[PDB]
């Protein structure tokens, strides 16, 4: 019925493959970018990797207790036993998540470890009728689930201001006011292909793992509700994006509450 134009765009780099299918036109699997499973740089970011600067926990358990320092950094550890965000998690103004790290006394299978375990959902790159390429889930995803990370090239504020191919930028704005950006234009993972939706089934959360340099949160998408098998993924690109692109095209997310139609 369709055309399986790839068995895995990640070439085996993700825990689970991410095929590409096109059921709509003759466009072959996208190849104008380099798939990378983790953030890269093409120009020094002086990410603070000094291991003695990490805050870490000394838990003698599985990091379920109120005493876990890494949990305290996050407000509380928001993950349940299955790895899902607690119902009480604020998806409107998500807190910063600090996962346990290699400086912690705890074990690798501790509770406070989710994003760092990589992809667990079966996803698929497919051709949409209205929006170019998009990503859909191939199975039921429960709410509060880690789905994928927004991966690309870490660049500076001012370098980002000169990028002419600007449809793949993700701004990292510190609470301190400092700003960097992830550009998935040339180097990126499956998240570069996730389209905007006005009623999103995904929310991005800033997460820290092997480093705690606050200029460089890593961006994790968690489901905000049950996503059904076959359902396209989407998050809210936000207002800064639309104030600019809205001059060139309109949102075709198709929602009856579409805010950018």
């Amino acid at each position: 019925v369709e055309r399986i134009v790839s068995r895995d765009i990640a070439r085996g780099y993700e825990r689970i493959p991410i095929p590409c299918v096109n059921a709509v036109d003759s466009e072959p699997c996208p190849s104008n970018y380099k798939y990378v499973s983790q953030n890269c740089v093409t120009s020094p970011m002086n990410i603070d990797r000094n291991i003695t600067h990490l805050q870490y926990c000394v838990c003698i358990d599985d990091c379920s207790s109120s005493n876990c320092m890494c949990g305290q950094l996050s407000m509380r550890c928001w993950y349940d036993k299955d790895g899902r965000l607690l119902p009480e998690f604020n998806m409107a103004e998500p807190p910063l998540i600090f996962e346990c790290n290699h400086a912690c006394s705890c074990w690798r299978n501790c509770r406070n470890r989710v994003v760092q375990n990589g992809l667990r959902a079966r996803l698929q790159l497919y051709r949409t009728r209205d929006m170019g390429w998009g990503v859909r889930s191939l199975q039921d995803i429960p709410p509060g689930t880690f789905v994928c990370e927004y991966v690309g090239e870490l660049i500076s504020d001012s370098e980002a201001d000169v990028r002419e191919e600007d449809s793949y930028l993700f701004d990292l704005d510190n609470k301190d006011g400092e700003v960097y950006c992830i550009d998935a234009r040339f180097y990126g993972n499956v998240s570069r292909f996730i389209n905007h939706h006005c009623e999103p089934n995904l929310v991005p959360v800033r997460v820290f793992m092997a480093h705690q340099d606050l200029r460089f949160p890593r961006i994790a998408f968690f489901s905000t509700r049950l996503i059904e098998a076959g359902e396209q993924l989407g998050f809210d690109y936000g207002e800064r994006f639309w104030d600019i692109k809205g001059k060139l095209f309109s949102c075709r997310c198709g929602s009856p509450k579409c805010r950018h139609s």
Partner: peptide, 9 residues
């Protein structure tokens, strides 16, 4: 100028 078309919101 304009500005930059970054996510999110």
């Amino acid at each position: 100028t304009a500005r930059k078309v970054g996510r999110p919101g």
